Design a protein around this ligand. Structure first.
Ligand SMILES: [Ca+2]
Ligand SMILES: [Ca+2]
Lengths: 50, 53, 49, 159, 49, 38, 53, 38, 106
């Protein structure tokens, strides 16, 4: 199990609170912080789609 | 016409998929117009039928 | 691969001697063709020499 | 299943970069070339360009198209309108995001060009494109038949 | 290998410094007396510096 | 069966097309084998 | 990948000797070695018709 | 600022056009710099 | 660089055709030595191009569905500058004194 970050929020990486089709810049800034991460592919695939 | 020839032959049978189609329960074969065909199956036993249009 | 791998007695003799090292190979899976391997033409190699 | 693979280049855009050999001189090109990776065997290269492939001019899927920045306004053309050549003409297979999969013969440069209604765009970079045989016979074009052998080529899919 | 290259950091009428990143074989060097050109026009308004 | 090149899809007739050409809304195989179950 | 296949060499035998007539289509490596403690290998690129004793 | 090749006119964005393209009535450089004084 | 009637049109070429004079736009004229070339400009009888090396030059266009060509066996050579021998000029380096054909017409 790995928890990602957007703020002081350890949300499940497979279910992010935002998606790119509804938030253009906030999801990119969400992926900005979780670059050094073993769980970046899951957050990626769950971050574009819903 | 100078003394050098190449050799003609009967063409073979070219299997064509765009002929066989599915109905509800059977296999529908629609040969092209003015042209014969033949169908070979092994769904039941050994089978051969030269259908014409 | 040398001169005279093809030997026809006259120009229109209708009987030729061929020793060209022709070998048949196995075709590729899902392809209708005749593959073969043979030594290249010795009349061309004689023209090159 | 191809769209979950594809969707990450929706996040991006094409851009205009600098090509030293444009159609006339040095200019700022919509199709500038970053690298040409030819380390596989049978003549498949992998370009990385300043353009995108597979997206429409808005951001969604579209089959065989190039997407490029043109002074700010992102435009698009079909992919059969884009030609490229090293020495002989090449053959584009597919594109996906910033990358393209061609099939080029060997040569000491690579030139990509498309044509608008009367404006011709080009980019030539001095990058060695090379051809690699497999095994102990040094062909220049791959044969019509022979024994099957193991190789290492660029994969066609965008997985 | 693959020579990765970070994008250039341009400052108009100012100066820069070098921040290390401890990347493999990382070369860093600053260049002055520049007058760059984007596709739109001159990126700076200063002649030198 | 299997294409020799890894990233390819195989048509009905044995012709290998790229895997991103399957289920795309454009016919590429003879008799549309990439356009059957999409 | 499909790789080509060179023509069959024409092997002539002698007392403790093997001759090889080699007609290549495109350049081809001939790699020989002895099966003893000293292999004495020979990596050669032959592009033309050549006899190797 | 001059160009390198001895017969070129220089646009506003640094790009060098041939010298007879300066006042030719057809837009060559970005923002029509060459066509401004003819 | 001239119009078929005799005016000065921008980028066109003006050719005779069995006594009568025609014209096409210059971007339908193509030439190549070994690989394709790129026409820069032209003035009077003289075209300026940019070409790789080869044994010949084939200038060609296509007015109707009738293709015009001419190949002449004239060597085109690519001449590098400096002590380092290249075939296509590099993306970067240092600037030396070279001598190229001047793009203008003075
Ligand atoms: Ca398709
Ligand atoms: Ca102009």
């Amino acid at each position: 199990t790995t928890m990602c970050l957007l703020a002081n929020v350890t949300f499940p990486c497979a279910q992010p609170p935002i998606c790119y089709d509804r938030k253009p810049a906030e999801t990119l800034a969400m992926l900005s912080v979780n670059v050094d991460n073993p769980g970046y592919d899951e957050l990626l695939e769950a971050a574009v789609k819903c | 016409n100078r003394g050098a020839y190449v050799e003609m032959h009967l063409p073979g049978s070219e299997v064509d998929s765009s002929l066989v189609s599915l109905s509800g329960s059977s296999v529908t074969v629609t040969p092209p117009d003015g042209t014969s065909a033949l169908v070979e199956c092994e769904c039941g036993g050994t089978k051969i039928s030269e259908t014409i249009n | 691969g040398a001169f005279g791998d093809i030997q026809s007695r006259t120009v229109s003799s209708s009987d030729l001697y061929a020793n060209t090292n022709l070998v048949l190979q196995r075709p590729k899976a899902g392809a209708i063709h005749v593959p073969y391997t043979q030594a290249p033409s010795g009349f061309e190699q004689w023209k090159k020499d | 299943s191809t769209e979950e693979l594809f969707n990450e280049y929706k996040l991006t855009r094409p851009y205009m970069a600098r090509c030293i050999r444009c159609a006339v001189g040095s200019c700022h090109s919509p199709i500038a070339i970053e690298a040409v990776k030819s380390d596989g065997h049978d003549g498949y290269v992998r370009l990385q360009t300043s353009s995108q492939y597979g997206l429409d001019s808005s951001g969604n899927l579209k089959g065989r198209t190039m997407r490029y920045d043109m002074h700010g306004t992102i435009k698009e053309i079909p992919l059969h309108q884009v030609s490229l050549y090293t020495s002989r003409p090449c053959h584009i297979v597919d594109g996906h995001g910033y990358f393209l999969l061609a099939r080029c013969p060997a040569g000491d440069s690579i030139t990509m060009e498309f044509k608008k209604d009367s404006v011709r765009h080009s980019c030539s970079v001095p990058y060695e494109v090379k051809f690699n045989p497999v095994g102990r016979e040094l062909y220049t074009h791959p044969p019509e038949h022979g024994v099957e052998q193991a190789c290492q080529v660029y994969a066609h899919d965008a997985q | 290998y693959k020579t990765g290259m970070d994008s250039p950091a341009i400052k108009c009428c100012g100066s820069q410094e070098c921040t290390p990143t401890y990347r493999p074989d990382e070369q860093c060097k600053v260049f002055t007396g520049v007058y760059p050109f984007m596709w739109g026009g001159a990126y700076c308004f200063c002649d030198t510096e | 069966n299997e294409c020799n090149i890894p990233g390819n899809f195989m048509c009905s007739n044995g012709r290998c097309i790229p895997g991103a050409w399957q289920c795309d809304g454009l016919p590429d195989c003879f008799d549309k084998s990439d356009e059957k179950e999409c | 990948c499909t790789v080509p296949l060179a023509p069959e060499p024409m092997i002539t035998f002698g007392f403790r000797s093997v001759s090889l007539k080699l007609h290549p289509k495109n350049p081809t490596y001939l790699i020989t070695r002895q099966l003893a403690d000293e292999p004495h290998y020979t990596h050669e690129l032959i592009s033309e018709p050549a006899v190797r004793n």
